[PDB]
Design a protein around this motif. Structure first.
Motif, PDB file in Angstrom:
ATOM      1  N   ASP A   1       0.846  -1.199   0.000  1.00 26.47           N
ATOM      2  CA  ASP A   1       0.000   0.000   0.000  1.00 26.47           C
ATOM      3  C   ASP A   1       0.873   1.237   0.000  1.00 26.47           C
ATOM      4  O   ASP A   1       0.640   2.203   0.735  1.00 26.47           O
ATOM      5  CB  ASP A   1      -0.937   0.042   1.199  1.00 26.47           C
ATOM      6  CG  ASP A   1      -1.958  -1.063   1.193  1.00 26.47           C
ATOM      7  OD1 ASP A   1      -2.287  -1.559   2.295  1.00 26.47           O
ATOM      8  OD2 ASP A   1      -2.484  -1.370   0.103  1.00 26.47           O
TER       9      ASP A   1
ATOM     10  N   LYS B   1       0.028   1.362 -13.138  1.00 29.52           N
ATOM     11  CA  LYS B   1       0.844   0.610 -12.183  1.00 29.52           C
ATOM     12  C   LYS B   1       2.309   1.051 -12.181  1.00 29.52           C
ATOM     13  O   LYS B   1       2.898   1.202 -11.125  1.00 29.52           O
ATOM     14  CB  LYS B   1       0.751  -0.892 -12.547  1.00 29.52           C
ATOM     15  CG  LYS B   1       1.482  -1.791 -11.585  1.00 29.52           C
ATOM     16  CD  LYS B   1       0.909  -1.728 -10.181  1.00 29.52           C
ATOM     17  CE  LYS B   1       1.608  -2.696  -9.278  1.00 29.52           C
ATOM     18  NZ  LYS B   1       1.067  -2.635  -7.910  1.00 29.52           N
TER      19      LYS B   1
ATOM     20  N   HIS C   1       3.402   1.778  -8.413  1.00 31.02           N
ATOM     21  CA  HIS C   1       2.331   2.356  -7.621  1.00 31.02           C
ATOM     22  C   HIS C   1       1.477   1.283  -6.963  1.00 31.02           C
ATOM     23  O   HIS C   1       1.506   0.109  -7.352  1.00 31.02           O
ATOM     24  CB  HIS C   1       1.513   3.285  -8.517  1.00 31.02           C
ATOM     25  CG  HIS C   1       2.253   4.550  -8.802  1.00 31.02           C
ATOM     26  ND1 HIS C   1       1.690   5.782  -8.618  1.00 31.02           N
ATOM     27  CD2 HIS C   1       3.529   4.767  -9.206  1.00 31.02           C
ATOM     28  CE1 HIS C   1       2.596   6.703  -8.879  1.00 31.02           C
ATOM     29  NE2 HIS C   1       3.726   6.116  -9.219  1.00 31.02           N
ATOM     30  N   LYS C   2       0.783   1.679  -5.911  1.00 31.03           N
ATOM     31  CA  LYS C   2      -0.118   0.799  -5.159  1.00 31.03           C
ATOM     32  C   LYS C   2       0.494  -0.571  -4.921  1.00 31.03           C
ATOM     33  O   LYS C   2      -0.011  -1.602  -5.366  1.00 31.03           O
ATOM     34  CB  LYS C   2      -1.498   0.680  -5.824  1.00 31.03           C
ATOM     35  CG  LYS C   2      -2.553   0.109  -4.915  1.00 31.03           C
ATOM     36  CD  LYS C   2      -3.791  -0.357  -5.653  1.00 31.03           C
ATOM     37  CE  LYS C   2      -4.822  -0.967  -4.720  1.00 31.03           C
ATOM     38  NZ  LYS C   2      -4.320  -2.195  -4.038  1.00 31.03           N
TER      39      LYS C   2
ATOM     40  N   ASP D   1       1.753  -4.116  -3.720  1.00 28.11           N
ATOM     41  CA  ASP D   1       1.172  -5.238  -3.027  1.00 28.11           C
ATOM     42  C   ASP D   1       2.135  -6.418  -3.116  1.00 28.11           C
ATOM     43  O   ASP D   1       3.213  -6.330  -3.711  1.00 28.11           O
ATOM     44  CB  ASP D   1      -0.246  -5.561  -3.539  1.00 28.11           C
ATOM     45  CG  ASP D   1      -0.274  -5.994  -4.989  1.00 28.11           C
ATOM     46  OD1 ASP D   1      -1.294  -5.708  -5.685  1.00 28.11           O
ATOM     47  OD2 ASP D   1       0.720  -6.610  -5.428  1.00 28.11           O
TER      48      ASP D   1
END
Length: 98
Positions: A21, A52, A67-68, A70
């Protein structure tokens, strides 16, 4: 006569941990004639510009943002810096901490 030169790394990648995150940042510095461009891979798969992955190149720096983040983003990241004289890469392992 004028010549070209295979790219040479100035600053390479190193193994990194980033939280989930979040955004992971990688930067390679490299030189070459002609000015090279970068091709990035994740575990040997293409990384391409999108929501992404955000790629940028400026004055001898080659940047990737993931990005983002996980769990799936963990793995081998390779930046290949290339021009018409050849290429050189730099790589590292990204670990995502949950």
């Amino acid at each position: 006569g004028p010549i070209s030169s295979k790219p040479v790394i100035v600053t390479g990648l190193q193994d990194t941990t980033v939280s989930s995150d979040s955004v992971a940042k990688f930067a390679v510095k490299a030189t070459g004639e002609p000015r090279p461009t970068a091709i990035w891979t994740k575990d040997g798969k293409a990384i391409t510009q999108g929501g992404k992955y955000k790629l940028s190149e400026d004055k001898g720096g080659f940047f990737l943002e993931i990005h983002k983040t996980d769990t799936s983003d963990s793995g081998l990241y390779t930046c290949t810096v290339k021009n018409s004289a050849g290429s050189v890469s730099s790589s590292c392992k990204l670990t995502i901490k949950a």
